[PDB]
């Protein structure tokens, strides 16, 4: 969770890979923005 000032491209998204089709590691790539300036609030908890 990031209530922080940054610019979003015309099509933000995420890149996911499955670690040799194991479906266990389930990593992600943060291709959603390119800045984190004037970042105010943050929050972390169990994934929804």
């Amino acid at each position: 969770i990031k209530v922080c000032e940054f610019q979003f491209c015309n099509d933000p998204f995420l890149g996911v890979y499955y670690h040799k089709n194991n479906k266990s590691w389930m990593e992600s790539e943060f291709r959603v923005y390119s800045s984190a300036n004037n970042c105010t609030f943050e929050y972390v908890s169990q994934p929804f």
Epitope: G15, Y17, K20, W25, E27, E29, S34
Partner: antibody, heavy 125, light 104 residues
């Protein structure tokens, strides 16, 4: 898109500090982990390490432990390293490549998408 | 972790060439094969035998339990290059000796 153009061949004396760098001039400096690999004649390819610009975490190779000081700054949009204690046998052609990702564990889900022309180095003694 | 391969391989043009990159527990390790031509920089051609677009459909293969194989189809004169098989093992990359393809 990225080109990873760099300087040409350089001539220097043996035992002196070696400085090389690769500059993109194309796509964003960040968002693409930069890797360097050494090409030598009849000796295969040698891997030294990698540095992620945005993350700032640099990984070293087993053989290059402590002989390289890799640094990268986003403001300058350039990646460079300092090399010393280099012998004539270590002379070879150095290459720089990207990975398209800036995550430590994601690098295995990618390859060397783009390479450099190769900057040969000659040692004079 | 350690890669050993034959120093060189020879095959007639237009034939199917099989290249073996033997190692120690390289199954489920994402082995990648690169191509370097004389006078040209290395390029990406494989990343499970998976070929990037814009590359002619000549490179293919399969990953067995403890061996990786590359199959070449429609070999031509311009295929003179050196193939290096590497993988991201223990957060590190290891480069093999490589094989030089010879065409009569």
């Amino acid at each position: 898109q990225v080109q990873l153009v760099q300087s040409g061949a350089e001539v220097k004396k043996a035992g002196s500090s070696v400085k090389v760098s690769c500059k993109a001039s194309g796509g964003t400096f960040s968002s693409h982990t930069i890797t360097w690999v050494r090409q030598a004649p009849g000796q295969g390819l040698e891997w030294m390490g990698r540095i992620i610009p945005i993350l700032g975490i640099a990984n070293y190779a087993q053989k290059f432990q402590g002989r390289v000081t890799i640094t990268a700054d986003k403001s300058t949009s350039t990646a460079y390293m300092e090399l010393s204690s280099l012998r004539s046998e270590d002379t070879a052609v150095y290459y720089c490549a990207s990975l398209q990702t800036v995550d430590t564990a994601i690098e295995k889900y990618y390859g060397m998408d783009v390479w450099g022309q190769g900057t040969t180095v000659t040692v004079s003694s | 972790y350690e890669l050993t391969q034959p120093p060189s391989v020879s095959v007639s043009p237009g034939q199917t060439a099989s290249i073996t990159c033997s190692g120690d527990k390289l199954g489920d390790k994402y082995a990648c094969w690169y191509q370097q031509k004389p006078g040209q920089s290395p390029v990406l051609v494989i990343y499970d035998n998976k070929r990037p677009s814009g590359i002619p459909e000549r490179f293919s293969g399969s990953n067995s339990g403890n061996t990786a194989t590359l199959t070449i189809s429609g070999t031509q004169a311009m295929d003179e290059a050196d193939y290096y098989c590497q993988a991201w093992d223990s957060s590190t990359a290891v480069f093999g000796g490589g094989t030089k393809l010879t065409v009569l």
